[PDB]
Design an enzyme around this catalytic site. Structure first.
Site, PDB file in Angstrom:
ATOM      1  CB  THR A 129      -0.941   0.035   1.225  1.00 36.33           C
ATOM      2  OG1 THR A 129      -1.624  -1.219   1.346  1.00 36.33           O
ATOM      3  CG2 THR A 129      -1.971   1.157   1.109  1.00 36.33           C
ATOM      4  CB  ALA A 176     -10.014  -2.438   2.537  1.00 34.80           C
TER       5      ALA A 176
HETATM    6  N1  3WE Z   1     -11.590  -8.393  -4.509  1.00 34.49           N
HETATM    7  C1  3WE Z   1     -11.713  -7.788  -3.316  1.00 34.49           C
HETATM    8  N2  3WE Z   1     -12.323  -8.306  -2.336  1.00 34.49           N
HETATM    9  C2  3WE Z   1     -11.967  -7.528  -1.162  1.00 34.49           C
HETATM   10  N3  3WE Z   1     -10.827  -8.194  -0.519  1.00 34.49           N
HETATM   11  C3  3WE Z   1      -9.708  -7.574  -0.192  1.00 34.49           C
HETATM   12  C4  3WE Z   1      -8.865  -8.460   0.377  1.00 34.49           C
HETATM   13 BR1  3WE Z   1      -7.118  -8.162   1.044  1.00 34.49          BR
HETATM   14  C5  3WE Z   1      -9.554  -9.792   0.402  1.00 34.49           C
HETATM   15  C6  3WE Z   1      -9.189 -11.060   0.858  1.00 34.49           C
HETATM   16  C7  3WE Z   1     -10.134 -12.081   0.700  1.00 34.49           C
HETATM   17  C8  3WE Z   1     -11.380 -11.814   0.109  1.00 34.49           C
HETATM   18  C9  3WE Z   1     -11.725 -10.529  -0.342  1.00 34.49           C
HETATM   19  C10 3WE Z   1     -10.777  -9.510  -0.183  1.00 34.49           C
HETATM   20  C11 3WE Z   1      -9.505  -6.125  -0.441  1.00 34.49           C
HETATM   21  O1  3WE Z   1      -8.512  -5.559  -0.012  1.00 34.49           O
HETATM   22  N4  3WE Z   1     -10.449  -5.448  -1.130  1.00 34.49           N
HETATM   23  C12 3WE Z   1     -10.428  -3.997  -1.248  1.00 34.49           C
HETATM   24  C13 3WE Z   1     -11.692  -3.779  -2.121  1.00 34.49           C
HETATM   25  C14 3WE Z   1     -12.577  -5.021  -1.831  1.00 34.49           C
HETATM   26  C15 3WE Z   1     -11.534  -6.157  -1.771  1.00 34.49           C
HETATM   27  N5  3WE Z   1     -11.192  -6.581  -3.107  1.00 34.49           N
END
Ligand code: 3WE
Ligand code: MG
Ligand code: MG
Ligand code: MG
Lengths: 222, 212, 231, 233, 235, 204, 244, 240, 195
Positions: free
Chosen positions: B1, B49
């Protein structure tokens, strides 16, 4: 000491096409090294042309889906039977998840459908409600096995046009529903070979303007 | 990040990377780390996030209510303080947030506030937050001037994220650029780091350590 | 007289005047009809407008896929009671995976209305409801009064001039109960029933409101050009 | 948060062509002490449902009282309590599943694994599982605790998928269940010889069998086994 | 004395009926809905010439797509407006969209009957809620202290309402332009007002899909008043 | 970490013939760091004297609390509170915080205005009363004070002789404690005159 | 229900008056007269006990003059029991302030606080107001010597000389006549007693029918002393001023 | 808790408790507000029925809510203190959260909201107070003057009066105040404010209070002699 | 935050506070003003846990400003310090205490005397000729114990303060990016813009 969480395994996959969307998932349910069920549906039609899956801890997964289905019902009651758009559903699910920020639903949620322009849509959530619209997303146990394959075969990453030697990328041509289903089946066949928690069966829900259709395929049962 | 924001003659530049990781696993390369609070205010995502997404959308709702009630654009000072006071209430509960609230108003001019989940609220000219923050600071500090053009300032922010994306394992994917003016923010595109790195290497002559 | 200041006071003849006054609000309301066969149950409602520029006040509210009602009296009170029914239907489905029986829904409405007739500070509900539904024991029609009295019927009517429709249904009893597997004919009988309560005005395209539920028919409301077929 | 004190071991079950079978032994263990030898862990609800419970016995007795109260409550102002508006297996399960998940969400679980076996109004077989975490699942065969590891493999050889259910008679199904109970007695240190078995059939209704025993046991081969390696005498 | 939630022998709530009398004493407000937009107009009615009339705020924004005009005890409207604004913004937060005009109106009307012995009495103000959404287009609602709301093609509330409503009965048709509606509100306001209508004692506003809710400048309204005078002198 | 030894300090009280004495050091510190040499630990409400050792914030808070309570007492009772009565008030006030206590070691000293009888008392942090005839000690050098007082003390000492005894008890005890010293004050209390004396001592 | 029996203690009359406040003021007009006079070198408080008996223990009796702290005192006119409720609250407020700021509470701040409590009983709660009027005599280092009064409405005002209770109209006229700005405490003592002697409903003004107090900087040097007069001391000052 | 609905509608659509609160305002001493080109002046009547008053310590009629906004009133004095306290707390709360002092309109809107709330809350009666709120917005040189009343309605005024005989002084202001050309200086504005009170007051001695508020937190109260000089000059021009 | 110093001389109180703000790895700012004016003749500097410092300081500021408006009067430095102490003493037994240490420098206009109060997060108050919080006293007090006189001028106080900062810059491991210095006297509060 009591552990309120568990892991029921499973793997899910959502892909957005030009005028369609698919949400697939294996039908195997497990704890530790045992199989609970060879056929336990994990991807659900939630009404309003929206399909949903909340993968991970199945109790939290069932609870979330149940509450979202309920939210769709009350959206109709409160707003004159207005159709819940996929973007509005996504924002609503964020609030359902973030409501338990300090005692989270231990799941990775994916929804699929069509946006208000009729184009294919997939949204992906973390356990506490952060979300994003995506073209392609695998979730659960074998997500790390599937996503790199999709980067390569859907988005044509690291592929260049022969003769140019790295100068010209392979153009991003649109895929049909038949083409996407082929990639989904091959993804789950490969995941079944290399991941112990993946197998038994594959259930795919396809979303178009005509509605929601289902397809089922056998997977290896070992 | 890696996220940054800096004040200059032409307003504010906001630049962020696009990578999200869970341990060593790269979860996404297409994360939107600039939150569009409203057409005049931007916020950056670092730490949690969901915490950033949720509470900065909520902030947008509070800003909208303010201008409906007061018939006037909310100040960056007031907007940032609504968020910092909110997270301060939750202090100890485990929120994770490190953000820059960015805006450009008549009374204030271009303004940036660093807001943080242990309650910190700092006004400043240059801020950089994330696992790759130290790399971006180096490029910023040595090239920053108040009298930068909009074109050169946009490039500086792009180049600083690239520096971090290269060295920091948990930063990368693509670069998102924004230019904040008094009449609102302007989006300046998504830039793939893979393609950007080679382009910058050739045109600039930098990264001689890397074979291309 | 001296005993109508609040709902907590009986009269010397054992009457509750505040409840009777709440009953009077229903009589001022626009007419609505309910009737059923063994396969379907139908609601017909005459909607009332304020003037020619205004819309026609909606009379029918959906409670679940298998249940809904029509109102006559204070509309906001119907919203409160229908919201409560929506919640109770919903509790039954979520907790017990069970569609709420129409008879049990009537019992719940009775008890909710009763509490407002025995306590100080509150007031009775000022609305009457006709609840139709299809559950595990077939088609049902209920009549709710804000006194708390709920009654299961083959057919009925409430509102202004409802006596004309009620007499018609009492004559037609043997005919309309036999209208099985024919939704259109059952609605026709309901439209003909509500016509016995009209004076000066007739059934127009934005005047009429119809709802139906049955064996393989979710609770659906028809308004606008969807009821022109029955005019 | 607590710990289970007095406990019951495996509950096992399967579907067959016309209904479902469920079984569980009659022991209440106190750690390694086999304390109570007359505990009924299959609890019938009406004539169409049998709930089998393992884990904490005090919590089982609480759940037993909830189910008893559920029957009383359903009969209130219900003229069709013994007909169209009787309790279905699906209603009973969903209620229990709701309670189990709510209790885990307050960090105060009912320390049990539960299998609800029954036949629905339309004749459909019902078989579903729920536990202390609120986790639920369905399968042609279901088992808790040790039964999951040892009974399921044996029962799955009879009904491996959905299409095997119509091909499986009640005689074949009961035979498989009884054999599984014998295997569990051989291999589970917290099991007993005495057990109960219940059959819910769409034609012949609920048959509840008490005081069953594990029989036809093989022990004779033990006489030839001597020492742990080199000993001959 | 007697309960605040008491029914009359006719089946009407005393307090609700009495609040309706307070609304009859209020200044006139008019709304006209067209396929090109909804117009909202009010009589300001300053009690003295030393009162700066532009501080009289009887037309109010709820959201970009929803406006509102008031008549009666206007102080009572402030908490209703606050609730409406909160409801509009909250729904956008929960659903990433605009709220339907009807749903907003219903939310405001839920407050109405929350009085007893909650607030101590009903609201003494009526609202004209105008707006646009994608499902039902341009809409105008009349929200009363009874909790009832009617949709209207055109509606007048306040002291000159029954005279204005009769005038709206004759003038409204389904093909009215936005300009025609503006002049029509001005014409009818001028008819029922005590004092002579000008840009300082009357106020116009509209809601369109493109530009959203806008309160008109005194200079803009002054031109429409001059345009009205000339077209009435034209025959 | 231990709240009762963050700031340091000591208090000692003694009875004599028709008199009482109470004394304290002047140090306030942050563990090893000396912060103030003017932090007096003895307070008085009318003719009743109260010394308090322990956590300094609680010392200040309790002084303010007992000033509060003795002022209301006087307005209602129309007389100054006596040592015996005040001792019970301190005990009651401390015990009300049984499971979240003030980290202090209070010491009461005074002469009953009606009987003329000398009075001293001590408390633990939670309110238990120690009503000794001879002496009361408190603080981070309480062990040292017990040793000094046990050997130096004799009953029925005249006011000016009691001054020497209590002064030497404090001084020598404080010089064997890292967290005590930096000055000292001694109160000599008779039925209707009180003398306050600041002592010269080593400043390390 | 219960509404039937509610007197509604907190409503306006058609003329815009508070019924219960007005009626409480009527009650206070029958209470013994209390007078306060402010001088350059101190304040005097004088008050008349209501028709007493020979068997009343005067030296331990207190119905008029109360100590709030070392710097502030009050004279009471009205229901004594009501006054003691408010007096205890005022004593607590003074100590709360002293604990918070480590300074004695300024006189007006204490007066405003008690007056606000009285106000609340006229606007909300449905309870009867306190049937009490106070004269506050006090000193602080901002304004020096100060006299205030408060009544059941919760309104308060500052005074050079003031009376409450019975015959205030007659008393105020007499004070207005003889009061001068350069007056001293000993002169003010005489004025207060002379005014009570003329306005009293009793046949003669004696020591057993009076309560008396002074607030003087006649405390050795830069401090203030409160003196609640004893029965014998009231008897002496009556002889000194030539009333008995 | 005491929940009785004291403010309720009557058959003719009036809330009598709110209307009777206005009658308490009618009884209160007269207050007047006049805004010039670069100032606002608040004038207040002091009834001379009370002499032997200590004017140093007696509650003054004009109260600072913040360094840039003032509040005067007519009606129940005790009631006004509750509104003044709430307004002062809100002013500091606004500075704390928004990092900017209140606008005059915002402060008015808050006080008016409190007054409205007390007209439809159970167990409470309305405030028997109308207020005049005057000042300058932060970094703004445009004068501001607002009025509130028991019902909770509020509005802006070029000049306004409240309290007893306010009908008379409003009559004066309506014919003497020109909108196209407001009192250009402090002198002219104070003179017009004193003139307006002299229509009603009695003696121009200690019966008239004057407070001048200028931009940038410049607030000062005129003394007896300063006001007395205005009183003198007004009548000497009148003898003609 | 880090270093806050105070010294009371003949006719004024001088407060010196570091400019650095560090969030773990990086120095995010080098011009931070760790002080709030409570009243025209009273200044408070602060240091402690992030967020809580500014939240507490602004809360105190708001309360003193409220008092000033209500009474039309400035509280004495002693009265302000007692109010602040009570708030911290209340805070230490709360669910989540304010982790904030403060110095209060004020000029008492009644007594015509400067006053410096040191209060830690527990509510431990002392009046001092010079004071500090954290490790600042460990480096500076030996210099102050030597040179300090009660009759020092403001200029002499600043010179002694410079010597203290120089010793800090020599022996302290952390770079605190210099100090902002403010003077509190009869005329109010002013900042020394070159230090
Ligand atoms: N494709 C995403 N899904 C979210 N997201 C994010 C993470 Br790290 C993660 C790990 C497991 C499942 C979902 C996850 C993550 O960091 N995200 C930021 C925006 C939403 C998300 N992106
Ligand atoms: Mg495998
Ligand atoms: Mg020592
Ligand atoms: Mg030492």
């Amino acid at each position: 000491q009591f552990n309120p969480y568990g892991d029921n395994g499973g793997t899910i996959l959502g892909i957005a096409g030009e005028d369609f969307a698919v949400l697939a998932g294996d039908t195997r349910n497990i704890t530790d090294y045992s199989i609970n069920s060879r056929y336990e549906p994990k991807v659900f039609d939630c009404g309003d042309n929206i399909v949903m899956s909340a993968n991970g801890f199945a109790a939290d997964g069932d609870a979330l889906v149940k509450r979202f289905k309920n939210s769709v019902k009350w959206y109709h009651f409160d707003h004159n039977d207005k159709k819940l758009s996929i973007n509005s559903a996504a924002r609503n699910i964020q609030h359902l998840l973030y409501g338990k920020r300090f005692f989270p639903y231990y799941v990775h949620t994916i929804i699929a459908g069509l946006d208000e322009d009729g184009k294919g849509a997939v949204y992906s959530f973390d356990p506490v409600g952060s979300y994003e619209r995506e073209q392609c997303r695998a979730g659960g146990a074998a997500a790390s096995l599937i996503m790199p394959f999709l980067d390569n075969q859907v988005n044509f990453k690291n592929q260049y046009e022969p003769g140019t030697n790295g100068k010209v990328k392979k153009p991003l041509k649109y895929l049909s529903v038949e083409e996407v289903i082929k990639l989904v089946r091959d993804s789950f066949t490969s995941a079944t070979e290399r991941h112990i928690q993946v197998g038994d069966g594959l259930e795919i829900l396809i979303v178009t303007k005509d509605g929601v259709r289902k397809e089922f395929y056998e997977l290896k049962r070992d | 990040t890696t996220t940054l924001a800096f004040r200059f003659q032409g307003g504010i530049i906001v630049a962020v990377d696009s990578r999200a990781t869970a341990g060593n696993w790269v979860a996404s390369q297409t994360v939107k780390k600039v939150i569009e609070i409203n057409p005049f205010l931007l916020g950056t995502m670092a730490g949690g996030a969901a915490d950033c997404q949720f509470w900065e959308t909520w902030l947008g709702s509070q800003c909208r209510l303010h201008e409906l009630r007061e018939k006037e654009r909310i100040s960056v000072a007031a907007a940032s303080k609504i968020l910092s006071n909110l997270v301060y209430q939750y202090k100890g509960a485990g929120l994770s947030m490190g953000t820059m609230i960015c805006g450009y108003t008549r009374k204030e001019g271009p303004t940036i506030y660093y807001v943080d989940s242990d309650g910190t609220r700092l006004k400043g000219d240059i801020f950089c937050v994330g696992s790759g923050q130290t790399f971006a600071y180096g490029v910023l500090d040595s090239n920053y001037k108040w009298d930068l053009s909009v074109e050169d300032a946009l490039y500086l922010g792009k180049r600083s994220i690239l520096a971090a994306a290269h060295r920091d394992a948990y930063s990368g994917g693509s670069v998102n650029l924004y230019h904040v003016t008094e009449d609102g923010w302007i989006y300046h595109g998504n830039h793939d780091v893979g393609e950007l790195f080679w382009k910058v290497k050739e045109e600039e002559g930098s990264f001689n350590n890397v074979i291309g | 007289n001296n005993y109508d200041g609040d709902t907590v006071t009986f009269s010397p003849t054992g009457r509750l005047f505040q409840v009777e006054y709440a009953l009077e609000a229903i009589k001022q309301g626009s007419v609505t009809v309910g009737l059923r066969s063994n396969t379907h149950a139908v609601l017909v409602a005459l909607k009332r407008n304020a003037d020619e520029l205004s819309s026609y006040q909606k009379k029918i509210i959906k409670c679940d896929e298998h249940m809904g009602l029509s109102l006559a009296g204070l509309a906001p009170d119907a919203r409160v009671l229908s919201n409560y029914l929506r919640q109770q239907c919903n509790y039954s489905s979520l907790v017990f995976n069970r569609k709420l029986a129409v008879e049990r829904a009537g019992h719940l409405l009775c008890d909710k209305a009763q509490k407002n007739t025995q306590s100080y500070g509150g007031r009775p509900y000022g609305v009457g409801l006709l609840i139709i539904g299809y559950d595990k024991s077939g088609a049902h029609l209920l009549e709710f009064q804000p006194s708390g009295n709920v009654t299961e019927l083959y057919g009925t009517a409430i509102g202004a001039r409802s006596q004309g429709a009620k007499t018609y249904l009492e004559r037609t009893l043997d005919t309309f109960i036999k209208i099985d597997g024919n939704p259109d004919e059952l609605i026709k009988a309901g439209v003909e029933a509500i016509s016995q309560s009209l004076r000066d005005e007739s059934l127009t395209v934005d005047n009429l409101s119809i709802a139906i539920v049955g064996k393989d028919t979710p609770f659906t409301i028809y308004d606008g050009e969807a009821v022109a077929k029955y005019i | 948060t607590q710990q289970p004190i007095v406990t019951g071991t495996s509950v096992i079950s399967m579907k067959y062509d016309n209904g479902v079978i469920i079984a569980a032994d009659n022991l209440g263990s106190y750690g390694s002490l086999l304390r109570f030898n007359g505990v009924e862990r299959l609890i019938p609800v009406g004539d169409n449902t049998v709930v089998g419970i393992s884990g904490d016995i005090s919590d089982m007795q609480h759940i037993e009282r909830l189910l008893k109260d559920l029957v009383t409550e359903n009969a209130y102002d219900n003229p069709l309590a013994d007909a169209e508006e009787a309790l279905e297996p699906s209603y009973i399960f969903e209620y229990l599943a709701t309670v189990m998940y709510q209790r885990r969400s307050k960090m105060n679980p009912l320390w049990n694994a539960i299998i609800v076996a029954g036949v629905q109004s339309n004749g459909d077989q019902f078989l579903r599982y729920v536990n202390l975490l609120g986790v639920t699942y369905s399968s042609p065969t279901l088992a808790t605790g040790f039964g999951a590891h040892m009974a399921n493999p044996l029962l799955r050889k009879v009904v491996d998928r959905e299409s095997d259910i119509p091909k499986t008679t009640v005689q074949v199904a009961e035979e498989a269940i009884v054999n599984a109970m014998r295997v569990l007695y051989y291999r589970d240190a917290r099991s007993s010889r005495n057990f109960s078995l219940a059959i819910i059939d769409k034609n012949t209704g609920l048959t509840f069998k008490k005081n069953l025993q594990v029989e036809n046991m093989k022990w004779d081969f033990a006489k030839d086994i001597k020492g742990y390696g080199t000993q001959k005498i | 004395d007697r309960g605040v939630s008491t029914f009359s022998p006719e089946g009407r709530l005393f307090q609700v009926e009495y609040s309706l009398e307070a609304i009859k004493l209020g200044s006139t407000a008019i709304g006209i809905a067209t396929k090109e937009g909804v117009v909202l107009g009010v009589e300001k009615r300053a009690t003295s010439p030393l009162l700066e009339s532009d501080s009289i705020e009887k037309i109010v924004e709820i959201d970009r797509h929803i406006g509102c005009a008031m008549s009666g005890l206007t102080a009572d409207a402030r908490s209703m407006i606050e609730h409406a604004r909160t409801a509009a913004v909250t729904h956008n937060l929960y659903y990433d969209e605009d709220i339907n005009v009807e749903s907003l109106t219903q939310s405001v009307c839920d407050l109405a009957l929350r009085f007893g012995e909650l607030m101590s009495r009903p609201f003494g103000v009526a609202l004209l809620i105008a707006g646009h959404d994608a499902d039902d287009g341009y809409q105008l609602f009349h929200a009363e202290p009874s909790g009832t709301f009617y949709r209207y093609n055109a509606k007048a509330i306040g002291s000159g309402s029954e005279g204005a409503q009769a005038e709206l009965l004759n003038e409204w048709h389904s093909s009215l332009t936005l300009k025609e509606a503006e002049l029509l509100v001005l014409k009818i306001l001028k008819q029922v007002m005590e004092e002579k209508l000008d840009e300082n004692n009357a106020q116009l506003s509209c809601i369109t899909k493109q530009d959203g809710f806008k309160i008109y400048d005194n200079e803009k309204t002054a031109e429409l008043i001059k345009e009205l005078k000339e077209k009435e002198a034209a025959e | 970490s231990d709240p009762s030894s963050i700031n340091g300090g000591i208090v000692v009280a003694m009875t004599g013939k028709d008199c009482v004495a109470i004394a304290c050091d002047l140090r306030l510190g942050s563990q090893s760091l000396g912060v103030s040499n003017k932090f007096e630990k003895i307070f008085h409400y009318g003719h009743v004297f109260l010394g308090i050792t322990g956590l300094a914030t609680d010392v200040t808070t309790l002084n303010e609390m007992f000033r509060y309570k003795t002022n209301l007492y006087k307005l209602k009772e129309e007389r100054a509170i006596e040592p015996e009565t005040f001792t019970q008030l301190v005990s009651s006030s401390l015990y009300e915080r049984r499971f979240g206590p003030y980290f202090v070691g209070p010491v009461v000293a005074g002469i009953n205005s009606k009987s003329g009888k000398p009075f001293i008392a001590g408390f633990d942090l939670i309110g238990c009363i120690d009503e000794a005839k001879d002496f009361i000690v408190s603080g981070t050098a309480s062990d040292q004070l017990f040793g000094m007082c046990e050997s130096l003390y004799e009953p029925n000492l005249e006011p000016e002789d009691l001054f020497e005894t209590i002064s030497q008890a404090l001084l020598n005890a404080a010089d064997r404690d890292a967290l005590s010293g930096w000055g000292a004050v001694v109160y000599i209390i008779k039925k209707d005159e009180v003398v306050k004396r600041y002592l010269k001592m080593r400043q390390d | 229900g219960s509404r039937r029996y509610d007197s509604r203690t907190t409503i306006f009359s058609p003329e815009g008056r508070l019924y219960q406040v007005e009626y409480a003021l009527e009650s206070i007009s029958h209470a013994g007269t209390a007078i306060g006079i402010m001088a350059s070198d101190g304040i005097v408080l004088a008050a008349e006990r209501k028709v007493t008996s020979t068997l009343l223990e005067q030296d331990t009796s207190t119905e008029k003059l109360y100590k709030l702290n070392d710097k502030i005192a009050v004279a009471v006119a009205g229901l004594t029991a009501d006054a003691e409720i408010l007096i205890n609250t005022a004593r607590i407020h003074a100590q709360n302030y002293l604990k918070t700021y480590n300074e004695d509470i300024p006189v007006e701040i204490l007066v405003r606080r008690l007056s606000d409590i009285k106000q609340g009983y006229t606007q909300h709660g449905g309870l009867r107001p306190f049937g009490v009027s106070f004269i506050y005599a006090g000193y602080d280092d901002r304004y020096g010597y100060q006299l205030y009064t408060s009544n059941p409405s919760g309104n308060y005002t500052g005074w050079k000389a003031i009376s409450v209770g019975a015959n205030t109209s007659a008393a105020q006229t007499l004070l207005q006549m003889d009061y001068k700005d350069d007056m001293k405490v000993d002169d003010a003592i005489e004025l207060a007693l002379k005014t009570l002697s003329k306005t009293t409903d009793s046949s003669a003004l004696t020591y057993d029918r009076l309560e008396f107090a002074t607030i003087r900087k006649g405390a050795n040097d830069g401090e203030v002393y409160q003196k609640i007069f004893k029965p014998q001391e009231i008897k002496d000052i009556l002889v000194k001023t030539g009333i008995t | 808790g005491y929940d009785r609905a004291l403010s309720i509608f009557s058959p003719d659509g009036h809330i009598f408790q709110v209307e009777y609160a206005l009658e308490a305002v009618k009884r209160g001493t007269c207050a007047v507000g006049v805004k010039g080109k670069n100032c606002v002046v608040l004038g207040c009547e002091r009834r001379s029925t009370l002499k032997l008053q200590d004017t140093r310590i007696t509650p003054s009629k004009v109260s600072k809510i913040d360094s840039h906004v003032v509040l005067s009133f007519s009606g129940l004095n005790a009631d006004s203190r509750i509104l003044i306290e709430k307004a002062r707390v809100e002013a500091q709360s606004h500075r704390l959260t928004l990092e900017d002092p209140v606008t005059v309109e915002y402060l008015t809107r808050y006080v008016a909201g409190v007054q409205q709330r007390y007209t439809q809350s159970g167990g409470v009666r309305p405030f028997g107070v109308s207020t005049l709120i005057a000042g300058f917005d932060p970094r703004d040189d445009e004068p501001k003057l607002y009025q509130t009343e028991p019902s909770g309605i509020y509005s802006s005024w070029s000049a306004q009066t409240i309290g007893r005989n306010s009908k008379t002084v409003r009559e004066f202001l309506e014919k003497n105040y020109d909108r196209k050309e407001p009192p250009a200086t402090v002198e002219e504005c104070v003179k017009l404010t004193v003139r307006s009170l002299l229509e009603v007051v009695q003696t121009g001695a200690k019966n008239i209070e004057i407070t001048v508020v200028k931009p940038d937190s410049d607030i000062v109260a005129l003394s007896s002699e300063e006001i007395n000089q205005y009183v003198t000059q007004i009548e000497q021009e009148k003898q003609e | 935050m880090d270093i806050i110093l105070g010294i009371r001389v003949q006719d004024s109180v001088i407060l010196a506070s570091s400019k650095a703000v560090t969030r773990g790895i990086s120095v995010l700012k080098d011009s931070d003003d760790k002080t709030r004016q409570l009243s025209p003749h009273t200044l408070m500097s602060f240091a402690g846990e992030a967020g809580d410092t500014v939240q507490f300081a602004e809360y105190i500021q708001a309360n003193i400003q409220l008092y000033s408006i209500r009474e039309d009067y400035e509280l004495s430095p002693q009265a302000v310090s007692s109010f602040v102490r009570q708030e911290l003493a209340k805070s230490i037994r709360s669910r989540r205490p304010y982790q904030v240490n403060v110095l209060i420098g004020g000029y008492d206009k009644k007594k015509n005397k400067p006053e410096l109060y040191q209060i830690d997060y527990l509510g431990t108050k002392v009046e001092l000729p010079y004071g500090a919080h954290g490790y600042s006293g460990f480096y500076t007090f030996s210099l102050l114990d030597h040179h300090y006189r009660p009759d020092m001028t403001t200029e002499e106080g600043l010179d002694l303060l410079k010597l203290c900062v120089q010793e800090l810059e020599k022996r302290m491991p952390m770079d605190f990016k210099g100090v902002i210095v403010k003077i509190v006297d009869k005329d109010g509060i002013r900042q020394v813009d070159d230090f």
